[PDB]
């Protein structure tokens, strides 16, 4: 036929290699060292998570006999709801203020896609020409919606205020920072206002507000840094969640200058303006206060998961060790 085949390792199927056999001297360790590493990490996660103070107030007012039901039927548009909660243990360090929403499918296909990524980046071409992707809220009557899409339209617009009921019974307002509650990349890369100009009014010319928004994206916040597409509250909302039950960062309570705790233990009342309706689809708005931990946040499931997995792996190796002994 043809000349002699060349003699090389690959062609002759004689490439150097190591043949690994699942010998009992190797599988048994990786079932004990794994079962020995996961338990201390499982205890470390579980013990630290339980040391994170957290109070979560459910103020949707669906159930009668609560001082918040009046806002389920808001005859007068500005509805104010007040709920009292007690902090038994003083919160330490930075305290994070979230808002929760249950049975709120932000991961729906028709909802997740319903945004124009180009417009949010500051694409002047798409500023007045939002894509088909945000079809249902592309244009209000004649001119386009600046934050087009269902994601921007259905934004969470309740107002939350924290008041400390001091010993004198005079409510003390609590400082709440609305800056730095979004990803650094989101503020400075993903979300940007349209280029040009100095005032946000001229930039957003010929663009209507979303149909559900009370006011346009002109004056989401007084500060020029926190208004427009670069608004923290708007950015945090558009950052879609993965599951029906989620909580999004709302405010920060930075470390107090004095040594005493940021939120000393006592009686607290939350002054919330009821604006967002959720009771139609059996939703549940909530306010969550949490304290920062050195190792991330509060995750009990991972703790019990490692105690279970660390324990299960240890037992499997023992069973494997016994089975190996019989068949040795």
């Amino acid at each position: 036929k043809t000349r002699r085949p060349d003699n090389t390792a690959f062609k002759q199927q004689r490439l150097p290699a190591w043949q690994p056999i699942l010998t009992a001297g190797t599988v048994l360790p990786i079932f004990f060292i794994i079962g020995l590493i996961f338990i201390p990490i499982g205890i470390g996660i579980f013990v630290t998570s339980n040391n994170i103070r957290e109070i979560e107030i459910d103020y949707t007012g669906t159930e009668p006999s609560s001082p918040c039901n009046k806002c389920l039927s808001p005859d007068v548009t500005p509805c104010f709801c007040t709920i009292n909660f007690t902090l038994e243990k003083s919160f330490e360090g930075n305290v994070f203020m979230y808002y929760g929403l249950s049975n709120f499918y932000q991961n729906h296909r028709r909802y997740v896609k319903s945004r124009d990524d180009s417009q949010l980046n500051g694409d002047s071409s798409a500023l007045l020409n939002p894509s088909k992707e945000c079809e249902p809220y592309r244009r209000n009557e004649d001119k386009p919606i600046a934050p087009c899409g269902a994601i921007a339209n259905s934004m969470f617009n309740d107002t939350l205020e924290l008041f400390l009921i001091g010993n004198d019974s005079y409510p003390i307002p609590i400082a709440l920072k609305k800056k730095g509650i979004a990803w650094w990349t989101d503020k400075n890369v993903k979300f940007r206002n349209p280029p040009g100009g100095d005032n946000l009014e001229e930039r957003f010319k010929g663009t209507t507000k979303p149909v559900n928004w009370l006011k346009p994206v002109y004056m989401l916040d007084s500060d020029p840094d926190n208004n427009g597409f670069i608004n923290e509250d708007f950015i945090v909302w558009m950052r879609t969640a993965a599951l029906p039950t989620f909580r999004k960062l709302y405010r920060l309570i930075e470390r107090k200058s004095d040594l005493h705790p940021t939120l000393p233990a006592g009686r607290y009342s939350l002054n919330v303006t009821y604006n967002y309706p959720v009771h139609y689809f059996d939703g549940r708005k909530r306010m969550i206060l949490s304290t920062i931990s050195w190792m991330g946040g509060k995750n009990p499931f991972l703790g019990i998961a490692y105690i279970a997995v660390g324990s299960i792996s240890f037992l499997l190796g023992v069973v494997l060790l016994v089975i190996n002994h019989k068949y040795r």
Partner: protein, 1035 residues
């Protein structure tokens, strides 16, 4: 009834008669593109991928780009179309060569050239020496006397020995000249065309008289004229009615058993995919009825009733869950098959040094079926033997010779050099001449025969109808006694370089019943010698009492018999002058027909060969290819049954059976007559031949057994079934005197009535039909025609290379394929079913759990290379251990590595892995991941955690699978994981992977997915170690 008129161009032109052109191609220049219908319909996966291409085209129902599926689809169809284009284009070049073969035809007036296409029924032709017959012709005349022609039917049966063919006496004495052939007008009413070769029924109507015809007068198409300057004939059958072309089969598209398994195990995934999507679609119809309508944030205009919304995503979930039957599997298999095939070509242990002819995998689609072979159907001559029938030993007088005791052959100028005779005592004795019996022995070998001389270009080549006789004359020539030439009445022989001419006066004929032949040669001095040669049994019955060497020669015959060498006793006589003169007058009276001419000849023949003197017996060795006896035992230990389908006569086929150790003294031979009693006994009632263990059936007896109305067909199926069960339980079956179609009939019989996977191996045009019929076809190189090579999936020169094809390249190719398929189905079921689990947490709205890019590149960059190198570089045991332990081949024959049980276990493993990959993160994101201003718990970070845990999990699962960890295997497995993280770390999603909780979750989902696999795999081998495991454990 066929009707042929000589030199009447328009007898039937007034469809049944076919012009003498052939076609073996399947495609024209236009109808090749419609070949898709044989790809789309045969493989359902091709149809399903076409549905996705159509399904993803309409924007109304779409969740993925339809360009990502067209490009893989074209590759899947493209490679198989280009692969089958070259196969058919090759068939066009060979068909053109056969068609353009030149011949001579009686046109109007004279013999003028006309190609093989231009030949038609009833068209007189002339053929020269060493010229192919164009069509089944009737011999009318020849250049040598009595209008006698010798033709080499090397294609009808794979034998080089010449065949006797005789023309009609009436045509012999009239149609000698060219002019008489032109005016010849002969009408033939012969049998209709059929596939039978040794039978021809017909008559020649001419000169107001009918002359019956027979197979001797009819030359066939696949034959070459030899030892005659020219011959004439007229075509009877032509083109496709030719008996060679009717002894041929279609070029079916051969598919592996695994390919057939995936058909039924891909229908299952379609049913599940439809049920899942239909099941989720019904769930969304209820979800939109209750939660979707009142969810104001989900309002998008275009009011669709909840039933319609569920209907729309039923397709939306087909695209989302389409990767259950990935198109990448059928794109990667092309690489696996192509790479595996190229290992056969590159194999240096299957490279034949002196011919410089490495192996060749001519069909890459069937690589993994070499590990599935249940039967081997092998030609005898050329495949098992070298087609060299040498002369090895001779017990001349009483002493045995050729025992390496103590050649140049220069002392005689006629030494061709074919003989490799090593003993020197014979050479010294011949030249010395101290024993006259030595000279008489070799002089007999150059006398008593029918061998013919060539003297072509000064070379004293020999051609004979009996291969044994040719070896003897060639053997005699090397020892000085050269057969110079022969005319009708006298024979010339060169003895030790001295001219010597004898006037032969009688040549006793050779017959199968006769088992011997003799020749009365009158010496120039005056002595009469009746030289005789034949089988030992018949010869010893006709010896004179004086013979003292009978016992000594008989002992020598046993020694030759033990060595598996054919033996023929030699004898002469000293008939007196007057003694033969009376007999010669009697012998001439016996030449006439009288009544039968058989008894008259048979009678007088007996008294001629009485009172003889014995010289000895020869030892003709039918050389076997090196490593053939080792191959048959090596493959026997692999539970492979080897059948020998051969065109040689029964005795030659039986003899090689003992040489190859297919038959042994233990085996008792069941012949055709014996079987017919058993098959008839079963009809009037496992088979007793299971204890006999051997089967030698002539092709003629196959027709009787096969027997080739509704009730008749019932017996036909039952009669075929009975034979196969009887034949399959014998250790060795040797089918002799079988036509090329009868070779494929037996292969079809085994395939249909046992569902066995068959390998057909052979050389020459004889075996092409069974090479095209068996599941695997192997063509031995060496034939100048290159006809079995070109029609065979694989081709290598020697037979011993079949050990590496089956036990190394076929054993690995099955293991590597099964490991590839099972993991590739696992890695996509685990990857694609996370969209099913996430359906319950997103309103059943067909939202993918991974980012869009990860959907596209999962099977491209992140999990593509590790499995391709496992499909090419995975060896359970080394090549030496594969051949040292043939029993490992039984793993593939029994379908142990890929089944429904093994397929569903991969689905079960994939389903649980998807369950773990989604629900362990779900626990870690349902409540709180490490949360602050810069935190995951997005959808993007949720998708990153599953993708990262999925990439590491599957790339760690292949690491367990690959038992041969080459540096490329290690680089690919760790490079795929490293590449995935390299891509998504700027060479958004890099924020999720920069936190402890995300990595702790990923470290968990990886381990929970893998640790149960390590425990299960470890327990499975410990409790139930496989045969490969034991050898690896004891390696």
């Amino acid at each position: 009834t066929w009707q042929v008129k000589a030199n009447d161009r328009k007898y039937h032109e007034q469809s049944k008669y076919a012009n003498n052109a052939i076609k073996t191609y399947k495609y024209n220049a236009f109808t090749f593109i419609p070949m898709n219908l044989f790809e789309q319909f045969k493989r359902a996966a091709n149809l399903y991928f076409l549905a996705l291409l159509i399904l993803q085209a309409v924007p109304q129902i779409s969740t993925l780009a339809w360009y990502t599926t067209l490009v893989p689809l074209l590759v899947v169809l493209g490679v198989t179309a280009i692969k089958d284009l070259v196969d058919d284009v090759a068939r066009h070049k060979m068909d053109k060569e056969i068609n353009n073969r030149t011949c001579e035809v009686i046109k109007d007036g004279r013999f003028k050239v006309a190609k093989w296409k231009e030949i038609q029924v009833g068209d007189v032709i002339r053929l020269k020496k060493n010229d192919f017959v164009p069509a089944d012709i009737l011999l009318l005349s020849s250049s040598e006397p009595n209008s006698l022609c010798y033709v080499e039917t090397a294609e009808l049966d794979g034998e080089t020995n010449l065949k006797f063919k005789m023309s009609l006496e009436i045509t012999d004495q009239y149609l000698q000249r060219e002019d008489t052939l032109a005016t010849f007008d002969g009408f033939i009413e012969c049998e209709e065309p059929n596939n039978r070769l040794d039978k021809f029924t017909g008559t020649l109507f001419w000169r107001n008289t009918s002359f019956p015809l027979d197979a001797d007068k009819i030359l066939l198409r696949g034959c070459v004229i030899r030892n005659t300057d020219f011959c004439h004939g007229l075509v009877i059958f032509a083109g496709a009615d030719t008996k060679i072309m009717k002894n041929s089969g279609k070029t079916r598209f051969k598919r592996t058993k695994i390919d057939y398994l995936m058909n039924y195990m891909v229908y299952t995934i379609f049913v599940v995919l439809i049920l899942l999507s239909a099941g989720l679609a019904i769930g969304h119809a209820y979800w939109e009825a209750q939660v979707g309508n009142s969810s104001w944030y989900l309002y998008d205009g275009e009011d669709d009733t909840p039933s319609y919304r569920g209907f729309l995503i039923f397709w939306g979930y087909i695209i989302v869950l389409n990767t259950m039957v990935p198109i990448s599997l059928y794109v990667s298999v092309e690489v696996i098959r192509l790479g595996q095939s190229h290992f056969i070509n590159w194999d240096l242990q299957m490279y034949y040094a002196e011919k410089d002819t490495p192996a060749k995998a001519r069909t890459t689609t069937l690589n993994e079926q070499l590990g599935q072979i249940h039967y081997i159907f092998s030609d005898k001559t050329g495949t098992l033997t070298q087609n060299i029938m040498t002369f090895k030993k001779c017990c001349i007088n009483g002493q045995i010779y050729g025992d390496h005791r103590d050649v140049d052959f220069s002392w005689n100028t006629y030494a061709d050099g074919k003989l490799a005779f090593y003993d020197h005592y014979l050479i010294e004795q011949i030249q010395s001449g101290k024993e006259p019996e030595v000279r008489q022995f070799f002089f007999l070998l150059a006398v008593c025969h029918t061998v013919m001389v060539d003297r072509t270009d000064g070379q004293l080549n020999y051609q004979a109808a009996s291969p044994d006789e040719g070896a003897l004359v060639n053997a005699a020539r090397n020892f000085g006694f050269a057969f110079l030439a022969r005319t009708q009445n006298t024979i010339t022989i060169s003895e030790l370089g001295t001219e010597r001419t004898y006037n032969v006066l009688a040549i006793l004929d050779f017959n199968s019943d006769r088992k011997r032949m003799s020749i009365i040669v009158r010496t120039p001095e005056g002595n009469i010698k009746l030289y005789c040669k034949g089988a030992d049994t018949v010869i010893y019955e006709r010896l004179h009492r004086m013979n003292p060497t009978k016992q000594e020669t008989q002992d020598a015959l046993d020694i030759f018999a033990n060595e598996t060498l054919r033996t023929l006793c030699l004898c002469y006589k000293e008939i007196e002058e007057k003694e033969f003169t009376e007999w010669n007058k009697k012998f001439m009276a016996a030449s006439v027909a009288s009544t039968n001419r058989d008894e008259a000849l048979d009678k007088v023949y007996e008294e001629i060969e009485k009172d003889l003197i014995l010289l000895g017996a020869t030892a003709i060795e039918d050389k076997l290819q090196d490593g053939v006896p080792e191959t048959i035992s090596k493959l026997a230990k692999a539970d492979i049954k080897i059948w020998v389908l051969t065109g040689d006569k029964k005795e030659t086929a039986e003899n090689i059976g003992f040489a190859c150790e297919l038959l042994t003294e233990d085996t008792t031979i069941c012949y055709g007559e014996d079987i017919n009693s058993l098959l008839h006994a079963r009809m009037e009632n496992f088979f007793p031949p299971g204890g006999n263990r051997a089967l030698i059936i002539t092709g003629s007896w196959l027709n009787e057994i096969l027997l080739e109305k509704r009730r008749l067909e019932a017996k036909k199926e039952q009669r075929q079934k009975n034979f196969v069960d009887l034949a399959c339980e014998c250790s060795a079956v040797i089918c002799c005197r079988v036509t090329p179609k009868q070779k494929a009939m037996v292969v079809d019989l085994v395939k249909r009535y046992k569902k066995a996977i068959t390998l057909a191996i052979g050389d020459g045009a004889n075996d092409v039909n069974m090479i095209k019929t068996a599941h695997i076809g192997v063509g031995i190189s060496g034939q100048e025609g290159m006809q079995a090579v070109m029609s065979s999936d694989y081709s290598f020169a020697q037979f011993r290379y079949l050990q590496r094809l089956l036990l190394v390249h076929g054993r690995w190719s099955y293991i590597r394929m099964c490991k590839f398929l099972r993991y590739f189905f696992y890695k996509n079921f685990a990857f694609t079913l996370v969209h099913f689990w996430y359906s319950f947490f997103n309103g059943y709205s067909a939202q993918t759990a991974y980012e869009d890019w990860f959907i596209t590149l999962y099977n491209v960059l992140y999990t593509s290379l590790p499995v391709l190198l496992m499909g090419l570089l995975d060896q359970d045991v080394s090549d030496k251990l594969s051949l040292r332990f043939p029993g490992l081949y039984i793993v593939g024959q029994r379908d142990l590595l890929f089944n429904y049980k093994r397929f569903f276990v991969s689905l079960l493993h994939g389903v649980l892995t998807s369950m773990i990959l989604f629900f362990i993160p779900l626990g870690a994101y349902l409540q709180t991941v490490g949360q602050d201003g810069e935190a995951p718990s997005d959808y993007q970070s949720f998708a990153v955690t599953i993708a990262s845990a999925l990439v590491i999990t599957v790339n760690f699962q292949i690491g367990l699978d690959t038992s041969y960890w080459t540096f490329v295997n290690a680089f690919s497995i760790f490079g795929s994981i490293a590449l995935y993280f390299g891509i998504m770390f700027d060479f958004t999603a890099s924020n999720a992977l920069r936190q402890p909780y995300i990595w702790l979750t990923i470290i968990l989902t990886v381990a929970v997915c893998l640790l149960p696999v390590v425990a299960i795999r470890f327990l499975s081998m410990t409790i139930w170690p496989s045969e490969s495991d034991k050898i690896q454990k004891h390696r």
